[PDB]
Write a protein that binds this ligand. Structure first.
Ligand SMILES: CCCCCCCC/C=C\CCCCCCCC(=O)O[C@@H](COC(=O)CCCCCCCCCCCCCCC)COP(=O)([O-])OCC[N+](C)(C)C
Ligand SMILES: CCCCCCCC/C=C\CCCCCCCC(=O)O[C@@H](COC(=O)CCCCCCCCCCCCCCC)COP(=O)([O-])OCC[N+](C)(C)C
Ligand SMILES: CCCCCCC/C=C/CCCCCCCCC(=O)OC[C@H](CO)OC(=O)CCCCCCCC/C=C/CCCCCCC
Ligand SMILES: CCCCCCC/C=C/CCCCCCCCC(=O)OC[C@H](CO)OC(=O)CCCCCCCC/C=C/CCCCCCC
Ligand SMILES: CC(C)CCC[C@@H](C)[C@H]1CC[C@H]2[C@@H]3CC=C4C[C@@H](OC(=O)CCC(=O)O)CC[C@]4(C)[C@H]3CC[C@]12C
Ligand SMILES: CC(C)CCC[C@@H](C)[C@H]1CC[C@H]2[C@@H]3CC=C4C[C@@H](OC(=O)CCC(=O)O)CC[C@]4(C)[C@H]3CC[C@]12C
Ligand SMILES: CC(C)CCC[C@@H](C)[C@H]1CC[C@H]2[C@@H]3CC=C4C[C@@H](OC(=O)CCC(=O)O)CC[C@]4(C)[C@H]3CC[C@]12C
Ligand SMILES: CC(C)CCC[C@@H](C)[C@H]1CC[C@H]2[C@@H]3CC=C4C[C@@H](OC(=O)CCC(=O)O)CC[C@]4(C)[C@H]3CC[C@]12C
Ligand SMILES: CC(C)CCC[C@@H](C)[C@H]1CC[C@H]2[C@@H]3CC=C4C[C@@H](OC(=O)CCC(=O)O)CC[C@]4(C)[C@H]3CC[C@]12C
Lengths: 262, 95
């Protein structure tokens, strides 16, 4: 049974890889794009089987017992997104089906990708399907514990994640502190800055998050105007943010080393 | 490296599926092909991959925001996996 279910999982991973095999090396009009290929048909069948397997699991285990395990929520989420992607794809298929059946209203579905609506179901389908594929690769956690060399690594990895989640409370508090502070400083200079950063709350969150991995430049503090007082305030707050973050990350690293030895 | 490979391949296929259609739309070729997606994610380990590899020129901000989340989740997952490797290797030296 373990080999049969592990072999089924490896086929589903193989289908996901080979689904985009046409564009591995490189890449009405919307009628062609909407249709499902034979690879897509198998993937839909696998997802339906996974949903039914989850339904039987929730039926016998009970809603309370099933919901208590947090990893089952992750496995339920990836199947919901996979169903979400395919229904959005079908909506784009049916809308193009009406347009082709007619042959103005039909004008939209002849357009190329550059002119698509931002909320096109085709766009939503591809965005969700990318998330589902990433999440579907996380079902290896049901097969890794069997192996005697990979099982200990998963157990050790789970302990690391739980410890990091403990320190995320302090990390969040410092993150939100500077995110609001930096946003209040640069909200007025929306068009003055060299690059949009700390201008909006979403943009301030994005800049400070990527600053953790050193992927945010220092020029996000610079302003084009002559107001060097506010720019110097930004340099201090951004500099204090990095010092505080490396201190918090250093404290987390040392405390996790202790936890391993204790 | 077994766990590291599994996480690497997970995002490599996921990011490629997201950005395969916007081959010419993106500011720089990254996550466009499987080879290009592998190259971008590998160099992201050493902080040598920019964040603008997620940005698209088109108005489709839904897919761009999906790319920001997946790329951000990838870095968090990688630093977690690298942190777990570092701590476990320190233990192995002392044991
Ligand atoms: C290592 C791990 C470190 C983890 C650090 C994590 C840190 C995360 C800290 C919390 C996240 C803050 C928001 C960031 C965000 O996602 O932007 C949101 C903006 O949403 C809004 O604009 C709503 C109004 C602002 C809400 C107040 C923000 C602070 C709330 C504090 C409450 C207490 C907490 C979502 O934006 P969007 O909808 O995706 O944008 C669509 C594009 N559009 C804007 C053009 C439409
Ligand atoms: C810290 C360490 C971290 C290590 C992380 C490591 C991670 C490595 C993970 C595996 C590497 C993935 C491929 C990357 C690659 O080398 O590109 C290949 C593309 O080859 C193809 O395009 C063939 C079709 C795609 C094959 C499917 C890829 C995923 C397979 C998954 C299978 C299960 C696994 C080779 O390209 P090229 O031939 O050199 O290109 C020539 C230029 N040209 C394209 C113009 C001709
Ligand atoms: C503390 C002792 C003081 C240390 C150094 C004091 C000496 C440094 C500060 C004086 C110079 C400030 C001059 C200035 O105007 O700008 C400098 C420049 C733009 O002109 O821009 C920059 O790049 C400057 C970036 C400033 C970073 C300062 C970091 C100080 C340490 C912060 C610690 C935060 C708290 C610790 C973590 C707590 C965790 C809960
Ligand atoms: C977990 C608890 C939640 C934590 C924070 C929840 C708060 C953060 C997420 C909510 C904001 C998302 C808003 C968004 O739409 O985009 C943000 C921006 C473009 O708008 O782009 C970005 O830069 C955002 C990058 C998002 C990175 C999120 C990282 C969360 C932690 C991930 C952990 C992965 C699993 C751990 C490792 C497991 C190893 C096996
Ligand atoms: C806690 C988990 C386990 C619940 C189940 C998974 C959800 C997180 C999934 C299931 C259905 C998904 C939704 C299905 C369809 C949509 C509509 C879609 O609408 C838009 O495109 C927003 C408009 C725009 O594009 O700007 C936004 C994503 C969303 C909410 C998806 C977000 C993720 C959802 C809620
Ligand atoms: C365990 C499983 C069975 C639960 C899965 C729940 C989904 C099947 C439901 C929940 C929310 C629904 C979604 C709510 C919003 C949308 C957005 C919609 O796209 C649009 O926003 C329309 C835009 C336009 O018409 O211009 C496509 C259908 C979809 C994904 C719906 C498809 C069906 C969804 C994903
Ligand atoms: C195909 C690409 C995109 C992903 C690369 C890894 C995958 C092929 C996945 C899918 C199936 C998985 C395999 C399914 C079968 C097995 C055998 C299994 O054997 C055991 O350790 C059990 C030993 C015992 O039975 O006592 C270990 C996990 C493993 C290697 C799994 C490892 C991860 C695999 C190879
Ligand atoms: C006791 C501590 C923990 C709380 C109080 C902190 C202050 C002592 C420090 C922290 C940040 C410092 C400020 C950061 C940078 C500036 C900008 C500076 O203005 C300029 O750079 C001049 C610009 C120009 O020349 O055009 C005036 C001092 C001030 C407010 C500093 C004054 C002293 C401050 C408020
Ligand atoms: C239970 C967990 C482990 C699995 C389910 C994960 C979801 C709860 C999260 C993960 C990534 C999230 C998505 C990442 C970012 C977006 C893009 C967002 O679309 C926009 O950014 C709007 C763009 C615009 O305004 O034009 C819609 C919500 C959504 C799908 C998020 C919905 C909630 C998601 C699916």
């Amino acid at each position: 049974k373990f080999v049969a279910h592990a072999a089924s999982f490896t086929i589903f991973l193989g289908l996901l890889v080979m689904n985009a095999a046409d564009r591995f090396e490189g890449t009405l009009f919307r009628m062609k794009t909407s249709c499902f290929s034979w690879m897509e048909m198998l993937i839909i069948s696998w997802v339906i089987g996974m949903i039914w397997a989850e339904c039987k699991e929730i039926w016998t285990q009970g809603p309370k017992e099933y919901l208590f395990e947090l990893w089952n929520m992750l496995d339920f989420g990836m199947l919901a997104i996979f169903a979400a992607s395919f229904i959005a794809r079908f909506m784009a298929f049916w809308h193009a089906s009406k347009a082709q059946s007619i042959i103005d209203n039909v004008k939209y579905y002849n357009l190329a990708r550059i002119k698509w609506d931002p909320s096109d179901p085709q766009i939503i389908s591809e965005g969700l399907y990318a998330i589902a594929v990433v999440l579907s690769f996380s079902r290896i956690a049901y097969i890794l514990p069997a192996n005697e060399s990979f099982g200990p690594l998963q157990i050790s990895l789970g302990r690391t994640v739980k410890d990091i989640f403990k320190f995320m409370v302090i990390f969040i508090m410092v993150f939100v502190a500077f995110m609001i502070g930096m946003f209040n400083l640069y909200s007025y200079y929306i068009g003055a800055k060299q690059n949009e950063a700390f201008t909006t709350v979403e943009e301030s969150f994005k800049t400070l998050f990527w600053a953790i991995f050193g992927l945010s430049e220092v020029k996000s503090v610079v302003i084009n105007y002559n107001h060097k007082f506010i720019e110097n305030i930004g340099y201090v707050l951004y500099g204090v943010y990095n010092v505080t973050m490396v201190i918090v990350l250093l404290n987390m690293l040392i405390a996790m080393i202790n936890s391993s030895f204790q």
